[PDB]
Design an enzyme around this catalytic site. Sequence first.
Site, mmCIF file in Angstrom:
data_model
loop_
_atom_site.group_PDB
_atom_site.id
_atom_site.type_symbol
_atom_site.label_atom_id
_atom_site.label_comp_id
_atom_site.label_asym_id
_atom_site.label_seq_id
_atom_site.Cartn_x
_atom_site.Cartn_y
_atom_site.Cartn_z
ATOM 1 N N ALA A 31 0.836 -1.196 0.000
ATOM 2 C CA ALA A 31 0.000 0.000 0.000
ATOM 3 C C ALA A 31 0.875 1.251 0.000
ATOM 4 O O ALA A 31 1.593 1.518 0.967
ATOM 5 C CB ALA A 31 -0.951 -0.006 1.195
ATOM 6 N N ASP A 165 -3.165 -3.860 5.926
ATOM 7 C CA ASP A 165 -3.715 -2.691 5.205
ATOM 8 C C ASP A 165 -5.081 -2.159 5.691
ATOM 9 O O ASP A 165 -5.920 -1.734 4.890
ATOM 10 C CB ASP A 165 -3.736 -2.952 3.688
ATOM 11 C CG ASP A 165 -2.341 -3.043 3.080
ATOM 12 O OD1 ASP A 165 -1.371 -2.557 3.700
ATOM 13 O OD2 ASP A 165 -2.218 -3.602 1.968
HETATM 14 C C1 LIG Z 1 5.677 -12.656 0.599
HETATM 15 C C2 LIG Z 1 4.547 -11.788 1.141
HETATM 16 C C3 LIG Z 1 3.216 -12.536 1.092
HETATM 17 N N1 LIG Z 1 2.115 -11.659 1.491
HETATM 18 N N2 LIG Z 1 1.578 -11.645 2.774
HETATM 19 C C4 LIG Z 1 0.608 -10.702 2.709
HETATM 20 N N3 LIG Z 1 0.541 -10.162 1.458
HETATM 21 N N4 LIG Z 1 1.512 -10.754 0.629
HETATM 22 N N5 LIG Z 1 4.789 -11.491 2.551
HETATM 23 C C5 LIG Z 1 4.557 -10.252 3.059
HETATM 24 N N6 LIG Z 1 4.855 -9.979 4.354
HETATM 25 C C6 LIG Z 1 4.621 -8.754 4.862
HETATM 26 C C7 LIG Z 1 4.071 -7.758 4.058
HETATM 27 C C8 LIG Z 1 3.821 -6.476 4.554
HETATM 28 C C9 LIG Z 1 3.270 -5.489 3.726
HETATM 29 O O1 LIG Z 1 3.017 -4.217 4.179
HETATM 30 C C10 LIG Z 1 3.678 -3.656 5.245
HETATM 31 C C11 LIG Z 1 2.915 -3.149 6.292
HETATM 32 C C12 LIG Z 1 3.536 -2.572 7.395
HETATM 33 C C13 LIG Z 1 4.925 -2.499 7.448
HETATM 34 F F1 LIG Z 1 5.521 -1.944 8.520
HETATM 35 C C14 LIG Z 1 5.696 -3.002 6.402
HETATM 36 C C15 LIG Z 1 5.072 -3.581 5.296
HETATM 37 F F2 LIG Z 1 5.828 -4.064 4.294
HETATM 38 C C16 LIG Z 1 2.957 -5.785 2.407
HETATM 39 O O2 LIG Z 1 2.456 -4.902 1.677
HETATM 40 N N7 LIG Z 1 3.204 -7.074 1.889
HETATM 41 C C17 LIG Z 1 2.875 -7.378 0.486
HETATM 42 C C18 LIG Z 1 3.767 -8.060 2.731
HETATM 43 N N8 LIG Z 1 4.015 -9.301 2.264
#
Ligand SMILES: C[C@@H](Cn1ncnn1)Nc1ncc2cc(Oc3ccc(F)cc3F)c(=O)n(C)c2n1
Length: 346
Positions: A31, A165
Amino acid sequence: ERPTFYRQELNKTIWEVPERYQNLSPVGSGAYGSVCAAFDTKTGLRVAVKKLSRPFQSIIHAKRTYRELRLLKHMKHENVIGLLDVFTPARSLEEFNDVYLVTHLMGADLNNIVKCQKLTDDHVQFLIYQILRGLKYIHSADIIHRDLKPSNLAVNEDCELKILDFGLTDDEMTGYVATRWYRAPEIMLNWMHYNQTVDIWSVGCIMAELLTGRTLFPGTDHIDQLKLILRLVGTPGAELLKKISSESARNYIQSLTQMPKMNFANVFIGANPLAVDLLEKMLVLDSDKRITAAQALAHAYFAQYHDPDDEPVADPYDQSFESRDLLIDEWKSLTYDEVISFVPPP
Ligand SMILES: C[C@@H](Cn1ncnn1)Nc1ncc2cc(Oc3ccc(F)cc3F)c(=O)n(C)c2n1
């Protein structure tokens, strides 16, 4: 003190992060920014680092950045994505232009795991329990997700789940799209000022899909989707019609041939009768009458998981900033204060 930062080009952009974070690797889009997997040498955790793209390019962006940081800083719950760290390479407010957010690296989103697949009743129980547990927490802070769907549910190998999100265009809502299939009708068609139980509608849609392996309301457009919804739950009665404050929306609903609510046992053939009952209580057209997260956790369907002493609520969340009009630099300064004041979790 301030950690040592090192630079690396990843998504055709220079990422500058503290030394503790090693082996950065692109995960994809998040996001309002791009996300990298990394190893946090300080905690031994696999982490997701999101670099916000142009966080202060406009008032909208600046407020959005402050909003996300405030939300992430507040959320401290097992089933909700929280903030492990937040940092900027900036040494002062005048240098401040980038924001990096750190959370747990999750295995996959729910969509990628379950698509086209019918889950066992026990797996559904565990997954939906965790969603509701997280939602009880989120809702207790008067926060609404508003966009709950399988792609916003992060899951590990042992089916442990976190909500992603929360609290955050017309084109991406158009047509045969998963971006709209989980939306409550009152938000999809702007019927009224909606409440927290828009999220409960979404849980109902997700739960049905886990039980059947099929999208519950795979509408080809807004109108097609409404028709699918009304076929299942029935057309609205006079009571709900009065609550549709949009004159135009109210007038349209009235033009539709009346239909009774269907028998959910005949729709979800073979399903646990307790699951059927819960779905009936979640998928109510009148949002005033939908089951709440707190109430749903106490439903007999979750007997093997429910524990009233292990389903915590959130501290009060002050979102008075939402009704506040400020300049870019003012939102920027507020964001900076929140970055500098961050205290990491145990
Ligand atoms: C390999 C994928 C599989 N996956 N899991 C959920 N969605 N996709 N694993 C994974 N792990 C974590 C996130 C975290 C995300 O947002 C955040 C929110 C708050 C923060 F402080 C940092 C972020 F990065 C994000 O946007 N994604 C797509 C993620 N993806």
